[PDB]
Design a binder for this molecule. Structure first.
Ligand code: CLA
Ligand code: CLA
Ligand code: CLA
Ligand code: CLA
Ligand code: CLA
Ligand code: CLA
Ligand code: CLA
Ligand SMILES: CCCCCCCCCCCCCCCCCC(=O)OC[C@H](CO[C@@H]1O[C@H](CO)[C@H](O)[C@H](O)[C@H]1O)OC(=O)CCCCCCCCCCCCCCCCC
Ligand SMILES: C/C(C=C=C1C(C)(C)C[C@H](O)C[C@@]1(C)O)=C/C=C/C(C)=C/C=C/C=C(C)/C=C/C=C(/C=C/[C@@]12O[C@]1(C)C[C@@H](O)CC2(C)C)CO
Ligand SMILES: CC(/C=C/C=C(C)/C=C/[C@@]12O[C@]1(C)C[C@@H](O)CC2(C)C)=C\C=C\C=C(C)\C=C\C=C(C)\C=C\[C@@]12O[C@]1(C)C[C@@H](O)CC2(C)C
Lengths: 177, 168
């Protein structure tokens, strides 16, 4: 009856055990929202998209700062400020990436709403397993848990890197030391 | 359910299997409120127009017709051809063809039996049975889509950088 994460709180009604990373940590009861097209399905899809985006962004920042930029690309070690140097010399790359992300996000929203309507697609599912790393069950749950935990950690990390780069105008590991 | 192209999206519910080049790609559901034959005709018309346009752009940046008016790049050829009246002739004959097309598409939508884009233009055969016709329709659709995207890229690159045939 009590949430596993917060023993002083009752179990959130909509979070039983199903989703990976579920420990009952919903103090504000946001999982019970059923308005403005927002429900547990939409919240989970947003969480998974945030997890994946944060993982990609943190990996990119760390890669560029440690191993350096790719040939022909600007340096500076400040990832929040090197973006304007890339846009100053290769605006077409940024524009094409933005257009591609826009199209993919329109497709993602359509897929989310459709899967919410005629329930056949789990939240965050895009059938993207080209290498077959999660075919069999009893490993899919473990992979989902790993992805969720890594994505939450990378969300926090990427938000921290964004704020550090905006404020200190220095590199992430530069702030570290 | 679970359209072939986008495996996580539902089938567009208007494209089951009985159209050439039908991989179930309609995420925004254009076929849900527009006739399928109308959209097919529009797509095939775009394919043919853009194939001709890509070939003409690339060729005219290499070979020029005799005369001083034909000595401009394809990027600047529009303002020269419109002034000389060269594009007026193309406009006149294209308008005639498009009025006949108005009649044809109206008849196709109101029964008839004319397949979308089927003008029966076939001096040579190149398509003897149903299988050959289907294969060549798929080839035409794929080549037309590729040429539409290719002309888009060619024009955008040439406008961005006023370069010759290599528009990099
Ligand atoms: C420009 C084109 C474009 C379009 C049309 C979309 C469309 C969409 N995105 Mg999206 N996105 C884009 C570009 C785009 N994205 C780019 C370039 C990125 C960064 C790589 C993202 C990152 C992103 C994330 C991380 C999420 C979406 C989500 C969504 C969906 C919810 C839209 C909504 O209600 O937001 C309303 C618009 C807002 C700005 C509201 C957000 C306000 C928050 C509180 C800002 C917090 C900032 C703090 C620091 C929708 C399908 C969400 C989703 O799929 O949920 C299911 C989601 O979680 N997008
Ligand atoms: C959220 C994900 C994300 C985003 C938005 C970016 C964004 C960027 N990266 Mg990047 N990167 C990422 C993840 C990401 N990266 C990951 C996961 C890795 C590791 C594989 C890298 C490795 C990487 C390198 C090695 C370099 C960049 C560079 C760049 C910049 C120019 C390239 C470009 O337009 O990207 C779109 C590019 C393609 C689609 C190709 C741009 C600011 C370049 C740069 O200027 O860095 C300073 C560069 O040299 N990235
Ligand atoms: C810690 C990293 C990590 C892990 C463990 C997973 C794990 C998973 N992802 Mg995933 N993903 C990640 C990062 C990760 N992701 C990032 C950064 C992105 C953004 C590019 C995505 C984008 C993504 C999509 C679009 C989809 C998945 C899917 C999946 C599931 C099946 C595929 C699989 O076995 O992947 C195993 C992954 C690894 C072994 C990581 C090796 C490095 C599985 C639970 C699919 C899913 O949810 O199906 C239901 C799916 O459609 N992921
Ligand atoms: C994900 C984990 C994580 C880690 C390891 C760090 C680590 C660090 N952060 Mg940080 N941060 C994080 C998340 C994290 N942050 C998040 C989620 C945010 C909010 C978006 C911030 C916002 C933030 C700011 C605004 C600043 C730091 C600073 C720092 C550095 C000084 C640490 C300290 O105690 O100084 C005290 C240190 C390298 C400081 C720094 O760069 O020092 C020069 C600094 O000014 N962080
Ligand atoms: C979308 C189709 C299209 C359009 C609008 C244009 C437009 C133009 N072309 Mg052009 N061209 C095209 C296709 C096209 N071309 C193709 C496919 C080729 C390859 C043979 C060429 C080869 C070409 C050359 C070599 C030159 C031009 C030039 C020009 C410019 C002025 C003279 C002229 O009209 O061309 C004259 C066109 C030709 C001599 C060949 C056209 C052959 C046609 C397109 C193929 C048969 C299709 C058939 C007749 C369709 C019937 C239509 C129906 C309604 C009845 C003008 C901007 C001239 C210029 O100023 O260059 C900058 C020039 O020197 N074009
Ligand atoms: C790769 C080029 C290509 C291909 C394979 C086709 C294929 C086809 N076209 Mg077609 N077409 C094209 C370009 C192409 N088109 C262009 C650029 C135009 C504009 C002038 C047209 C205008 C056109 C008309 C007006 C008609 C067709 C028709 C046809 C079909 C029977 C004729 C045939 O076998 O064509 C053979 C073509 C080739 C072998 C291409 C090589 C040429 C060098 C077939 C599906 C007919 C149809 O709808 O039948 C069902 C018909 O009435 N086409
Ligand atoms: C049809 C496929 C195709 C191919 C092979 C290329 C190929 C290329 N494009 Mg491109 N492009 C295409 C379609 C294509 N484009 C489309 C449909 C658009 C949108 C209209 C663009 C918009 C575009 C821009 C804006 C730029 C390129 C650039 C480039 C070059 C890098 C390379 C030669 C770049 C380049 O070198 O331009 C000078 C560049 O800046 N492309
Ligand atoms: C930003 C604009 C907000 C848009 C609101 C969309 C839905 C939000 C909503 O209705 O839930 C608002 C959420 C949902 O609140 C939940 O509602 C459920 C019934 O609908 C149950 O009653 C839950 O117990 C209750 O917590 O409540 C809060 O988050 C209030 C927290 C305020 C903290 C201030 C510090
Ligand atoms: C209606 C809609 C879409 C939809 C739909 C459909 C289509 C109807 C389908 C469904 O049926 C429903 C629904 C709702 O899904 C809404 C669209 C979404 C919006 C409104 C898009 C918002 C995106 C904004 C982002 C993601 C911007 C991020 C900015 C960053 C800046 C980066 C910086 O580097 C910059 C530039 C400068 C640097 O110095 C430092 C920083 C600041 C870090 C980080 O990235
Ligand atoms: C949109 C795009 C790029 C957009 C870039 C933009 C907006 C950037 C704009 C800017 O930089 C400028 C210009 C100047 C700056 O000052 C301002 C900004 C704004 C910064 C590229 C698309 C590029 C699109 C591309 C490359 C498409 C390739 C498509 C292929 C290969 C298709 C293949 C098929 O069609 C066939 C062949 C057969 C079919 O049946 C099957 C498939 C597979 C679908």
């Amino acid at each position: 009856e009590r949430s596993k994460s917060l023993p002083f709180l009752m179990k959130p009604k909509n979070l039983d055990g199903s989703m990976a990373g579920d420990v009952g940590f919903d103090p504000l009861g946001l999982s019970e929202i059923n308005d403005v097209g927002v429900d547990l399905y939409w919240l989970r899809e947003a969480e998974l998209k945030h997890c994946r985006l944060g993982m990609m962004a943190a990996a990119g920042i760390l890669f560029v700062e440690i191993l350096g930029p790719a040939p022909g690309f600007p340096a500076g070690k400040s990832q929040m400020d090197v973006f304007w140097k890339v846009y100053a010399e290769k605006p077409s790359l940024i524009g094409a990436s933005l257009a591609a992300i826009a199209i993919l996000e329109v497709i993602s929203g359509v897929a989310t709403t459709q899967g919410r309507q005629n329930g056949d697609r789990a939240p965050g599912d895009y059938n993207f397993d080209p290498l077959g790393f999660g075919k069999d069950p009893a490993k899919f749950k473990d992979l989902q848990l790993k992805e969720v935990k890594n994505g939450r950690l990378a969300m926090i990390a990427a938000a921290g890197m964004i704020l550090q780069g905006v404020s200190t105008h220095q590199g992430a590991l530069e702030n570290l030391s | 359910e679970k359209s072939k192209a986008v495996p996580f999206l539902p089938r567009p519910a208007a494209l089951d299997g009985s159209v050439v080049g039908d991989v179930g790609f309609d995420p925004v559901g254009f076929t849900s409120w527009l006739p399928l034959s109308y959209l097919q005709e529009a797509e095939i018309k775009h394919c043919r127009i853009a194939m001709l346009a890509t070939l003409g752009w690339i060729v005219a940046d290499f070979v020029h017709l005799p005369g001083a008016v034909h000595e401009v790049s394809s990027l600047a050829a529009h303002d020269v051809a419109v002034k000389s009246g060269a594009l007026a002739q193309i406009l006149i004959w294209t308008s005639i063809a498009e009025a006949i097309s108005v009649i044809a598409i109206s008849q196709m939508l109101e029964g008839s039996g004319r397949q979308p884009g089927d003008f029966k233009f076939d001096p040579l055969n190149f398509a003897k049975d149903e299988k050959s016709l289907k294969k060549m329709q798929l080839s035409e659709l794929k080549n037309g889509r590729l040429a539409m995207l290719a002309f888009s890229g060619i024009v955008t690159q040439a406008a961005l950088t006023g370069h010759a045939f290599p528009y990099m």
